Nucleic acid binder design. Sequence first.
RNA 1: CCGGCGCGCG
Lengths: 268, 220, 98, 107, 478
Amino acid sequence: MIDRYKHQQLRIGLVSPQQISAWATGEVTKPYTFHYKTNKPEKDGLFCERIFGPIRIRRYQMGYIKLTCPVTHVWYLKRLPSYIANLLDKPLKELEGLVYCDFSFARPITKKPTFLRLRGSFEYEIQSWKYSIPLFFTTQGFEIFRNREISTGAGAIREQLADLDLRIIIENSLVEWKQLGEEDRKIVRRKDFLVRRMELAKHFIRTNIEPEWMVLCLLPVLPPELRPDINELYRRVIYRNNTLTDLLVMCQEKLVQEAVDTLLDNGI
Amino acid sequence: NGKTTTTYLIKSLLGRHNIYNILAVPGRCELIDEEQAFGVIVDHANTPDGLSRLLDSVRELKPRRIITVIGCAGENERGKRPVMTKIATEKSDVTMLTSDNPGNEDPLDILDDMLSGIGWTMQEYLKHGEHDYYPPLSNGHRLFLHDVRRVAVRCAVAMGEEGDMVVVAGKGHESYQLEGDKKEFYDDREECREALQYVDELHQAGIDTSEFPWRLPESH
Amino acid sequence: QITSKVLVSEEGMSNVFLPGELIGLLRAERTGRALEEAICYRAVLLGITRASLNTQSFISEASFQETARVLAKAALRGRIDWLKGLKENVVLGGVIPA
Amino acid sequence: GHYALVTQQPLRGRSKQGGQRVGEMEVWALEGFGVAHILQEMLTYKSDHIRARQEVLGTTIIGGTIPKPEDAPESFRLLVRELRSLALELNHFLVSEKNFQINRKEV
Amino acid sequence: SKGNAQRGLELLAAMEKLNYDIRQAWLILVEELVRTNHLEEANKVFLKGARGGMRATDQLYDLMIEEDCKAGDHSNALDISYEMEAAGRFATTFHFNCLLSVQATCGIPEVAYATFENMEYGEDFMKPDTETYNWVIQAYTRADSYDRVQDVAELLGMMVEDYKRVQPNVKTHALLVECFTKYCVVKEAIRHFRALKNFEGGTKVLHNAGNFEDPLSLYLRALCREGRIVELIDALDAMRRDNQPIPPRAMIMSRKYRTLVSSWIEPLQEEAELGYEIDYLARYVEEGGLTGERKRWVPRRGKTPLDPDAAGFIYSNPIETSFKQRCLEDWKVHHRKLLRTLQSELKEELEAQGLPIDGTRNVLYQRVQKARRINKLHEGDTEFWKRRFLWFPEEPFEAFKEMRERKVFDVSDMYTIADVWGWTWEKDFKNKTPRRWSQEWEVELAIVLMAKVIELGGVPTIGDCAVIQTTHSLGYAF
RNA sequence: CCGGCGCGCG
């Protein structure tokens, strides 16, 4: 007897901004849901007929929200243990402060040259960096090279994730694990963190997932017929994102991130 | 040789090469003076022979230390990229590195082609940058590098010292920048003027800008 | 199902297994006879809840408990479910393989 | 009759002329019996398969044999969109046992 | 004979209309169509006949399956096998191996594993043989994505447990060496390469004619990177006896223009003196800097290796380890094993630096304040363990006797891959005190390796010899 | 044709 072979599979995976655009292509730009008088779908709104379809396709057609600033995914930062913190190898407190407080990260990227001795996450603002360096380096060129030595928020996280060398991560983790072994509570927990980090970095190499997708550049929008509460949270994202692009300031950047976190996962 | 220099003087200088021009200037060793303890000149030499000639000419003017800024274009002159950086390293103490006109070609690859003449690459240089330490050359010289000419020449101007000298080359009297396909407007003389204008505050603000990385006061 | 897994010991470093990894008992013994690459393991007793969260299907775990935790961990590594179980095909509305 | 707007499943309640729920405990009993085709009836084209609900209404009136749905019910498509809203993509693939060609099911 | 399948079908229909038995004519037509090389029409006619209730001979079934699988047509072969099993002839290991020959190249190991599971837990005539294990292993080691080292290891264990009925061949060891090389399990690759050496061809099979990235070159590179120079020399002898020239991938040239000849001595990733300045202009010109074909060593965003040497491995090549370091590591691991079986005040600041002068008074203070400016074993011996082996009681030996009496475990279950596959040489590479590294040993090994690489067709560079009369024999000059 | 609160039946 030859078995009647059936090879069927389904796979989840972290999505890319390009695939989000391919889903939408179709961007929701206005927070208006419906007309107060005519009870018609507002154009470019959460229920736009052009974006989603005539009033079957409205159950499946997706949209997206073009966020001015990248926002981290709450599942991959705030859930314990943090995946972003483990892959970046930093304590959760400093990452949360970088995302939620007025903290700036020194040396966020490596694959481009720098010229400063700024390391770590300096909580206080650098006095020289406020006036001295920008006033000597003017504005246009300074902003051109600005996002290479000091940055803040989820943009710094995305920059750190994008330029990560996973193989170097695996090798450093393995050598540190060997050093720890060749030498008793967190002498083991540090080892367990190291084992968890190489297994996390190994999975990225063999898959098509990118660790920078853990910070969102676009926000997919649920089809309208599935949300005839969720609508209110979608307006807030547009409410605070459209405010942010009008400015272009740090406080509004945090407000957009909190709107996405509440929409994605509250009570966390 | 010196046709531009001769015509301007006839219609109306540093080194012994310009002395014969007087006996018989925009983009030809245009001195940039802002009451500093050094000098800044601009030359159009984008060729190894002319660059070598001028770099030899600087030595005869008795400079205490030699600092040079060099670059190369993209999609062209691919067969002689490392020679300028080789001669600059063998003729100058601390040499800044950048591009001349990257064009469509990515400037990072050309800047890698710079270090090929010394036994380095962008990978090794950037690993040096991560460890915030740059061991000197074989002949005791120093090497620093930056992708964009802007901050590179700003730091070079900030590194003008007493009896010292800084060369920025590759552009000359041309006042355009070639990135991708758009010819951006960029003047080396005016940018050097601006850098010389406001050099004081960067050094007096507690920042030891003497070398990469700068020893910031609160960064240790 | 309670007594079908072993725990890779904290000192077992290899490219086949990592320390703390939960592997099947039969697989562990088979690799023991074939490799001598520090295949160190100890028998572990799993409860009916912990065992149900270490299955070969992420749909079965997501529909059992901690849906957000299961889906977040799985979606990071592109996990593939081959729908060999009864509950997986119930979710899809297809015919169960029984 | 009438179905829910989102889940597209039959309504709940006698006053609303709704249907009876086949809970997970009822699904276990059917799996214990091995009646895999009774279970699929009450999972796809008696609950939420919009396309297959309409054809069952037509075939039974003419008595011309009911075929297998082969597509996904609206409850699974509803879950896929929700997972898309969390930046997660869930794709269903069929691998042919003949020529090993991967077929992406519409979901 | 002419390939006129439709004419043959019309003649068969005419035969049927004339109340004739068309089975013999159908068989003759199918066989003729196969012989004349019309496999498509032969398959169509055979499938028409089989679906019509007609039964073919065993020879015709086997011919159809084998030809279809040789042509890469898995669909027709699977259909014909299903029809043959419907007609009353069950599939054996031959038909299953024919089917597996095509599934192993589909890029999805699960198809081949489903077929293997069908074979393994079936009847006696469907049981897997060496070819089946080879097909499934090849399917798993050449997967498109995800790791499969665990699957291959478990499959190898299952094959080992089937020793009384199955034994390996050259392809088994070649596939295992390739798998354990791509995943950087180097010691297992060395074991299986030792097993593979005894087969003629051997490393030639592992070479795979350069296809599949040329795993033989990967084996040589993995041996070189970890400083397993004795094993590298043994591999070189293996290819020399097999008349296998060292491929260019194995002879890849390092960052500092070095190769496997000089990469494990105390100058690591550095050049030698060479007696003169290095011609960097020549290096730039010869590397393709004239036509834009150079390889720029700048890091880039993406999960791809910048180093061309890492191409082929699953998670990049093994890290560079000198032969001096590898010998010291082997000395330490042996002695860690030996210890295991046995049990069964300002001057203090000077130690943090190089102690420059100092000693009398105030020199220590000035230096401490100015220092801030810079800121017997029996492994593998199954017989010994079998001898030692001879409510479950808490006493370990009483417990062992209990599992012997309750048939939980017995000495008949104590065997490894070594003692069931006839690996008699394995006991000569274990339970031995490792040789201490020495400069004389390293230089003699370097000379031997250089000679063996030269005689194999691989030319070492001038920088390789500079690290070390043979230097000038290659055409060089200091 | 949406959710909360209260009261019930097996």
